[PDB]
Each structure stands twice: as structure tokens, then as C-alpha cells.
Amino acid sequence: MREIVHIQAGQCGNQIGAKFWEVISDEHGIDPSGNYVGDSDLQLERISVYYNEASSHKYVPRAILVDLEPGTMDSVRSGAFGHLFRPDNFIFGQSGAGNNWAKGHYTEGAELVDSVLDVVRKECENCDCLQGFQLTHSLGGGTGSGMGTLLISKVREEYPDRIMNTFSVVPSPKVSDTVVEPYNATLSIHQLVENTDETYCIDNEALYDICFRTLKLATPTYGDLNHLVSATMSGVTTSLRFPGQLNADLRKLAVNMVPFPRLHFFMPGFAPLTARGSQQYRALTVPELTQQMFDAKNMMAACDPRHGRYLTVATVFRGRMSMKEVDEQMLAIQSKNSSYFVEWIPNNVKVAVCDIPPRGLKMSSTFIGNSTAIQELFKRISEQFTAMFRRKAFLHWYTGEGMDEMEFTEAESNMNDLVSEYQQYQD
Amino acid sequence: MRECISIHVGQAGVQIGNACWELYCLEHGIQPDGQMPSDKTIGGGDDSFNTFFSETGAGKHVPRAVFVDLEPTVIDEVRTGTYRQLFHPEQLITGKEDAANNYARGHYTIGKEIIDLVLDRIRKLADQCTGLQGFLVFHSFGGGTGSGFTSLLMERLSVDYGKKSKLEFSIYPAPQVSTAVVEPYNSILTTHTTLEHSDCAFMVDNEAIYDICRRNLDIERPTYTNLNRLISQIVSSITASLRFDGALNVDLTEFQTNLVPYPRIHFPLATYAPVISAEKAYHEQLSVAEITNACFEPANQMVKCDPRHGKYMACCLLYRGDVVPKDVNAAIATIKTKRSIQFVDWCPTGFKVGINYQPPTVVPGGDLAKVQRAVCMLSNTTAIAEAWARLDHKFDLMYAKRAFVHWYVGEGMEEGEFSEAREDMAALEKDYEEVG
Ligand SMILES: COc1ccc(C[C@@H]2NC(=O)/C=C/C[C@@H]([C@H](C)[C@H]3O[C@@H]3c3ccccc3)OC(=O)[C@H](CC(C)C)OC(=O)[C@H](C)CNC2=O)cc1Cl
Ligand SMILES: Nc1nc2c(ncn2[C@@H]2O[C@H](COP(=O)(O)OP(=O)(O)OP(=O)(O)O)[C@@H](O)[C@H]2O)c(=O)[nH]1
Ligand SMILES: Nc1nc2c(ncn2[C@@H]2O[C@H](COP(=O)(O)OP(=O)(O)O)[C@@H](O)[C@H]2O)c(=O)[nH]1
């Protein structure tokens, strides 16, 4: 039972992670009090990886929540699992998360992260075995990225023989405002690349473009985003939570998935996307499910995979259907869409099936891809930063608290390097 | 007296070990208690089956063998299974970290930090026995454990026991049940470091077994249960010679001599006719000549290859029950009539034969249909070129893009080393091409 320590920080990170944890607990059926009220014994067979044990035999999920605005538990209790997290490790800041990198990444907050690292180190050893670390946040500026990549650097320092993972969200100038973020993102990911190899780029722009246009919305609120993300990035780890064919561990997930030590930006999707409606819907069929699988609109990234090629694909079906027939349409897709995949990497279709269905849904399937497609999103975020770097806007605070211009230029150089790598490996 | 030791490395290896060992215990009249067949009940036996099992004070016939893996996922999963007391508790090792399809992980990261315990246990087991002949290896190409740990372990064995032979039961991997795309990499990385220590290897093909379990065994979704049971049956059909009686292919040295001309080339094909599915009562009957002549068909050849397009080197068989040599020789003569088979131009190539006096034993609660006739061809046909070259081709496709190289590099391999291994096996393909 290789346990996982969950790291989590930031206003958006906590918002997404609360609903994610609620979804996973509900699917596993443990009561919001913290006791097993599930409906079978296939739940607690090895699930200690996410849920530890208390003295009174009640379970206890392990996940750290930190920030720099003092009120987090005041906002963490906004759902249904406030006291559920152990009530001694809600380390809180003092100021807030203005969109200022290095205001958490160099001087203040960095003072707090030493104690944070001490606490997480103390937290880790109690388990029987360690799997690694995985982190949920957004690349959003304002203590959201600083603390994130900072703690990434120190955890990678302390445990080189484990695996990182980021559930970060790329900001976008369609849903949001306070436009200094391109700096924050394109600078933090600049060392996220060297510091981590396991990433999911849930494009907020794509989430809006699919949630407001063709999902019957008028003003997408933050809970609206939280529904879709707490669906997809909660179903992404069912393979970890549930035994099955592709039980691959973090290290093994990587070795099956990441060819090169940098080209590791997975772009996920989820075929039965659903806005918040209590009624489930009419039923869907397996070929329809696996066809909405590659729905370009369905993609949680900013591209249509038809416009590019894949490298290493996974898939996790869920429900009760034809177990052994899924290979038929897997090979059908392979045969009719050879151009979509690449010849450099044969048999890039690792597939598996999980018996359990999700909450409020019978037939569904979480998806993971790895394609050249995210070159489009990176070109977007690179132009949406370079077209404004010429005016040197707002770099006063950054240049005052400990950055410099050469750092900005070298970050742009690194990201042009990544887009070049994607381009050439597409060529 | 004589004896032998079977090693078990990897999840697949230990699953097949459980299946095979349970079948063997069933076959000899032994029971999950092993009360007594007809013998002294303490240090008894005296037939050939003693070479696998040895009686304790209770006459239990403990199988002096071990199971090894780097994660307590499957080892424990069967340690509290049917044969809990058949094997010795604290005689099944459990690793901690899975090799995770990484050959270097089993070669220089975690297996290297535990191999000492495995060596101590196997050496103690050898001290317990008195008549060791060699070793039986159950591993797989694809897995990091069953390749890296396998290679390193057998290297240690060849270092300390430099005389005895050894036989490898590996599993040639298939895309249809593939759980990695680093699988050719691990396969090459281990096999390029086997010939120097390996003596003979019986590799089984997943796609071939899958096609057997479907096209004739009436399955559509075969799990590891179906494939594993079928391969356990075929492995029993191979080793029955060592299990019972003096006949063709009794000893491991005899195995290799009857089979292996040249030390580098020691990959022999294998077949086993009865694949008749299940409780489907009777559509036809059985016949010695029928199964013998149908053996040459590419139906049941353990590994997918085209033998009729390649020159042979030897031919051995084996039969279960319903013994009468005369019609056996008549069947040999009938199939002898040179339809398209060929042989070696510089040595006699007779169809060596050794018969056994026991019909096949089928699992008491499984798919296979009870039969009483059987054949088992251990042909040393050169046509395994095709399969090896296919794997090599799948390998060198992904080397122009330097794919996945860093993952192995990070633990102590070398980038250009892979080119050396690829040239080694290109030369081995040339070696197959030499025979013409
Ligand atoms: C043309 O000039 C413009 C002027 C305004 C606008 C719109 C205007 N803003 C920006 O894009 C400016 C971004 C900078 C950023 C700088 C680069 C980071 O170090 C800052 C910092 C943070 C905390 C403490 C100390 C320093 O500051 C801020 O974080 C503050 C927020 C609060 C905390 C003052 O600023 C806003 O965002 C304001 C208050 C919210 N509103 C807006 O949407 C657009 C343009 Cl283009
Ligand atoms: N016939 C058969 N093949 C199996 C079985 N288990 C695994 N395989 C195949 O063996 C290959 C790899 O072996 P695995 O057991 O998956 O790997 P492993 O030895 O556990 O290696 P690690 O996962 O790296 O520790 C794949 O082609 C699997 O499909 C089994 O019970 N029977
Ligand atoms: N995906 C997602 N993005 C959000 C949410 N709320 C705000 N955002 C945007 O994504 C980024 C959130 O990260 P961050 O800036 O660290 O949030 P902060 O801690 O409130 O400053 C910001 O640029 C926001 O504009 C949310 O609930 N989900």
C-alpha cells in the first residue's frame, strides 16, 4: 500500500480540491462524517493510499491546505468536508494572494514554507509505504504559483526517488481579468518543466468555451467550473484507487506515458460532460461513448487533436458493458486513424476498464492523452505574453522584490524551446 | 538420488508457478495435504516425482522451490490461497517497490539491493537437497522484474554454480494484452545478457496462446486464468518426461544435447495437441495418428512462426497413456513421407520418441476437456527468426526518435549500449540466416 501525500495550496487550488475530495469520497461512499457507509467491500481493499486510519478505526484523509490570506478554513467549510480534514494543519498566511510572483516565492510565505515542509515531512513517515506527491492548483498569479513551484522545488530536493504530479490550471483572458498573469504563468512553468514530469493542463479557456457556449450557461460561476473539474480530475485517479488491468504506479504511469524528460503535458477529456442537472440523462452506448471520447470540443485543452498527432494515450472506461469487446473499437480507431497517432511510437493505446460507475452516472470514461496538440495552447500563452512584454508593464514589483529582466527573457527562451520541441517531433 | 530447483520471478512467473505446481501435485496423486501415495511416508517416494517434492516428517512432499517478486501484490495474494500450507511460510519473498516496466529498476535500483537474500535462500535450499541437476526459470520479457531480476539472478547462479544446466520458461509478449510500450526494450535488454549464462529457454507467445484459448477453447475474453491454465498444461506436457520415467529426454543435459547444436541458439519451438475446449461432450473421437499428424500444423505451435518455410534441425515427441509402439511407428512412417518437411544435410534427423504410461490429468474445476491421448513436439525449428526479427523491428522503430531512452538512462545504463545489443541480435538473426 504505497500511500500518497496530497499537497494543495491557493484559493483556486482549495476550491477545486474541496469538490474533488467530495466527489471521490462520495464515489467511495464514506460518509461526510468520516465513516464507511459504502455499498460493497471492493472499496476499502487497499484505499489507505488516500485515506489513513485513526485510533477509533475511523478513517482520515491526508491532504495539506495552505495559503497566504488568513481565512481558508473560513472558506474551506463552504462545502461539506470542512472539519473532515484533520483540524490542526490549516496553516494560514497573513496578507493574501495579490497577483505577485516572488511575493510568496522569495521572501514572505517562503518563511512559512519551512515550517510547512517540516509539517509535511512529519506527516509522511507514518505510512507503510510512499508512492509520491501530487499537487492541485492553478498557474494563476498571486501566491497561487509561487508557493506551488516553490514547494515543488523543495519536495523534489528532499525525495528525488519519488514522483511529482501537477493538476495545475492554465489561466486565460476570456473568463477572467487582472491581466498580469501571463508573467506569473510563463515564469512559474519555466521551472515547473525542469522540476516536474507529470502534468495535466486543464485549459480554463476550453472549459469556458464548452461550458458557456454548448452547455446552456449564461455566466459561468466558479462552482460551475468546479463541477467539471471535480468530475474529470477525480475520475483520472480511479486507476490508482481501484484495482484493475493498468494499475500502473506513478513511476510506471510515467514510464508508460512520458517519452522525453520535458514533453510531459497531458491534455485530458471526458465524453459524458454534464452541467449541474439532477436528472442524469438518456442512456448512451459504447461506440457513442468512445466517439465522444475524441470530441475536439470535449477536450479540456485548447486545441482540436485532429489538428495534430498523439504520442502516448491512456483510457479508463467505467460501468457495465462489453468488457472484452472494447478492443474491437480500440483497434478500429487505430486502423481508421493511423494518421492521428504516430509511427515513431507503435501500440500507443494502453486501455483498461473499471467495473465501478461514478456517482450520478452509469456509463462514462475518464481520458488521458499526450499529443503535439498542446503546442497550440503554449503558442497562445507565449504570444499573449510576448505581445505585452515590449511595454514592460507592471514589472516594477517583480523587479523590486528580487527578479530581473534576464529571467523573463530566459523563461521566454525556454518556452520557445518547448514549442520548438513539440513542433519538430510533430515534423 | 537426484533433484532440481525451479525459480519463480515476477508476477506472471509466480502465477504460472502456482498453476503448474497445483497441477503437478494433483497429477501424481499428491493432495494439498500429500498424505501418501503408496510409499515409506518418511523420506519415501523413490520414483521420478521425488525430483520435485521432498517429504518432511509428515511425508508432505514439500516442493523445494521459491517465488519472487518486487511487490507484495501477487505473492501474498496466493500465499493465502489454496496452497497455504503446501509451501513453507517465510519461504516466499516479497519485495517492496515494483520495477514498473523499467529494466534498470530491476537491474540496478531495487533488485540489486535484495538479490543477496534470494541468493542466501536458494543456496540454503540447495544445501537442503542432495541431487541438484539444474534450474527451471519462470519469468517474462516485458516486466521489469521478470527481466532485470531474472538476468541478474541467473548471472549470480552462473558465477557460483558454473556446472549445472538451466532451463528458462519465459513469455514472449503480445500487444493484445500489452501493459507497456517499453516492452521490447526490456525484452532486448534482458535477452542480450542471457546467452552468456542461459543454456536452454522455453519462451511462450501470448498471442499464440490467446488464439488457442479462443479459436479452439471457446473463449472471447480470456483472463490470466485461462491463458495461465493452458500454458501450465502445456508445460506439464513438456516436463512429463522428467516427471515419470526413463525415456526420451530425461535429463536437462539430455534435453540440450537432443535439442541444442550451437550454444548461442537454444530457443526450441514446442507444441501440445489436445486443446479441445470443454464440457462440450463429443463431436468426434481421438486417435494417436490423428493427433500426431495434426501436430505439424501451425495450429498449436507455442510461438507464431512459419516452420514449413524453414529447415528443421531435430524432432522430439512424447505421448501420454494408451501405449502401443507399433501404430506410433506406423504414424511416424506415414508423416515421414516428405510432403514439404526438410532437415539438416549433415546429420541424421530421426523422429526420436519416448512414450509415457499415464493419460493427461486435467484440473478438477477448469475449462480443459478430459482426454487420454497427447503429443508434445519439442522441435528445434530455425523459423523463430521471423518472431525475433519482428521484435527487433518493433525495437529499432523507436530508436530514431530516442524514445523512452532517458527513463532507462537515469539509473545507470548507457545510450550507445542499446546499439551494441541491437547489433548483437542482428548478428543472431544473421546466424539463423546462416543455416541454408
Ligand atoms: C494599463 O494599466 C492597467 C491598469 C489596470 C488594469 C486592470 C487592473 N489590473 C492589473 O492587471 C494589474 C496587475 C499588477 C499586479 C502586480 C504586477 C503584482 O505586483 C503586485 C502586488 C500584489 C500584492 C501586493 C503588492 C504588489 O498588481 C496587482 O496584483 C494588484 C492587485 C492588488 C493586490 C493591488 O492590481 C490589480 O490587479 C488590481 C487592483 C485589480 N484590477 C485590474 O483588473 C489593466 C491595465 Cl493594462
Ligand atoms: N500468460 C500470462 N501472461 C501474463 C500473466 N501476467 C502477466 N503476463 C504478461 O507478462 C508480460 C509482463 O509481465 P507482468 O507480470 O505484467 O510484469 P511483472 O513481471 O510483474 O513486472 P513489473 O510490473 O515491472 O514488476 C505482459 O505481456 C503480460 O501480459 C499471466 O498470468 N499469464
Ligand atoms: N480553474 C479555476 N480558475 C480560477 C478559479 N477562480 C479563479 N480562477 C482564475 O485562475 C487563477 C486562479 O489561481 P490564483 O490566481 O492562484 O487564485 P488566487 O489564489 O485567488 O489568486 C486566477 O487567474 C483566476 O483568475 C477557479 O475556481 N477555478
Numbering used by the authors:
A (entry chain B): 1 to 427
B (entry chain O): 1 to 436
Sentences from the study reporting this entry:
The cryptophycins (Cps) are a class of macrocyclic depsipeptide natural products derived from species of marine cyanobacteria in the genus Nostoc. Cps destabilize microtubules, thereby preventing correct mitotic spindle formation and inhibiting cell proliferation. At high concentrations, Cp-1 and Cp-52 destabilize microtubules and cause the formation of curved tubulin complexes and rings. Cp-1 and Cp-52 bind primarily to a site on β-tubulin that overlaps with, but is distinct from, that of maytansine as well as those of rhizoxin and PM060184.
